[PDB]
């Protein structure tokens, strides 16, 4: 999206790298390779610069039936910061990322990985009394989303319920 919008326009792009999996650096390098004036920052500063951002554009792993999102960790904070400043939040996701499931499968929604990413193994004897959790995904409510861009065009979250009905059968929700 950004590399196609940059061949005819010129704008500012800021990438906040995720703390557990710092994959934002790769995207920042790939964007700077095309000359888009890309900036890199951490998650703690997401709110700090939020007052100087006109639009937020993100993607997700899957979309729930009520319009909610299962995104990478730290995205709920970004949505809250965008809602605080009334900044529109755009979601780029194709049609094969729609799941008929509803947010009722808690305690398994997030993906938990080894605590080695958060706290290293070389800390010492404190690892026996400290509980370290590293969730990969997080839940984003539908009221913090402004638009959904898909292969069929632009839609609102309040219409996602229809798209599901046009893709899956109600008897195949539980599978």
């Amino acid at each position: 999206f950004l590399k196609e919008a940059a061949r005819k326009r010129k704008f500012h792009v800021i990438v906040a790298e995720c703390a557990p999996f710092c994959q934002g650096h790769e995207m920042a390098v790939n964007l700077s390779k095309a000359g888009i004036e890309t900036t890199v920052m951490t998650d703690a500063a997401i709110f700090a610069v939020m007052s100087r951002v006109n639009k937020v554009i993100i993607g997700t792993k899957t979309i729930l039936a009520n319009g909610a999102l299962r995104a990478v960790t730290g995205t709920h904070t970004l949505a809250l910061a965008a809602k605080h400043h009334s900044t529109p939040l755009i979601v780029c996701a194709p049609m094969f990322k729609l799941s008929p499931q509803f947010p009722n499968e808690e305690d398994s929604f997030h993906k938990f990985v080894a605590p080695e990413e958060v706290l290293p193994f070389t800390e010492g004897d404190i690892l026996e009394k400290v509980s370290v959790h590293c969730p990969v995904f997080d839940y984003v409510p539908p009221e913090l989303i402004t638009l959904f861009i898909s292969n069929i065009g632009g839609n609102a979250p309040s219409y996602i319920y229809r798209l599901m009905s046009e893709l899956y059968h109600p008897d195949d929700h539980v599978l």
Binding site: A65, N66, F102, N104, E106, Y161, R162
Partner: protein
């Protein structure tokens, strides 16, 4: 005429809703009707719906009456004979009454999954749908607490508390003025509805709008459980826009869809933006 006595005697089952009894009475009087034209049948049934609403001022009765009129107008579009059409209407009404009776369990078995263990739910008044949802979760080996409001106009929260105590559920009765006090100690709000308006809001007991506002102010999820025959094409702009035929101290009020999270109907789990879709597709 002596039609209201058949509707009052139809409500001898304490678990039967008012709209269900109204629809059953309408179907019975359609079966016993001796007319030979569809216009006369429509007129007689509109007058009967008016007479039934004159007794019960609930919005569910009007919703069921409009749904029955729409069903008649839909079934009168294919055959155009009033005898073939009459038999088809009788069969479809029997099937519809058979399918409506299974809506409560269909809502309960689909909504009880949203209740976690050790949670705290907040209810306003006595509702059979909420009671079925709560009794379907305790059967799934779940433990939780319930706070029920007293419903000062007529004490309905005490009946709900007695039912929950009979179901071996820890329930605490709170006052109508203490809703803003215990809202911080609740996980979710599950309430019923007497009628779902076009825009997605609800029409429920007078102490529902303030509780929805308090839940929105504290980011508490507000869930509403209601059947599908309670979908009425009304658009109240404010509290005064609600017709006085339903409020009569007001007995009912309107809650905007901006404060409702999800709806659990026999059609499934929907958003406040799906009721208008069904009402448009039905051409009510």
């Amino acid at each position: 005429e002596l039609i209201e006595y058949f509707k009052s005697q139809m409500k001898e089952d304490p678990d039967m809703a008012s709209a269900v009894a109204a629809i059953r009475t309408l179907l019975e009087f359609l079966k016993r009707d001796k007319g030979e034209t569809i216009q006369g049948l429509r007129a007689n049934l509109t007058s009967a719906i008016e007479t039934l609403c004159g007794v019960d001022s609930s919005v569910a009765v009007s919703s069921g009456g409009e749904l029955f009129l729409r069903f008649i107008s839909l079934a009168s579009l294919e055959y155009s004979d009033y005898s073939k059409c009459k038999k088809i209407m009788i069969e479809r009404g029997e099937l519809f009454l058979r399918r409506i009776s299974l809506s409560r369990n269909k809502i309960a078995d689909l909504c009880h999954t949203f209740i976690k263990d050790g949670a705290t739910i907040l209810t306003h008044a006595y509702s059979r749908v909420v009671l079925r949802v709560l009794e379907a979760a305790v059967a799934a080996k779940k433990r939780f607490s319930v706070y029920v409001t007293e419903s000062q106009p007529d004490l309905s929260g005490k009946k709900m508390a007695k039912a929950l105590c009979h179901l071996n559920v820890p329930v605490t009765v709170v006052l109508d003025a203490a809703v803003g006090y215990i809202m911080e100690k609740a996980d979710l709000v599950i309430v019923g509805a007497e009628g779902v308006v076009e825009n997605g809001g609800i029409i429920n007991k007078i102490g529902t709008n303030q509780m929805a506002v308090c839940a929105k102010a504290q980011n508490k999820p507000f869930y509403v459980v209601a059947e599908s025959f309670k979908f009425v094409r009304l658009f109240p702009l404010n509290q005064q826009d609600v017709p006085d035929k339903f409020k009569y101290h007001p007995w009912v009020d309107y809650t905007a869809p901006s404060l409702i999270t999800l709806l659990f109907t026999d059609l499934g789990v929907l958003t406040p933006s799906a009721v208008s879709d069904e009402l448009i597709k039905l051409y009510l």
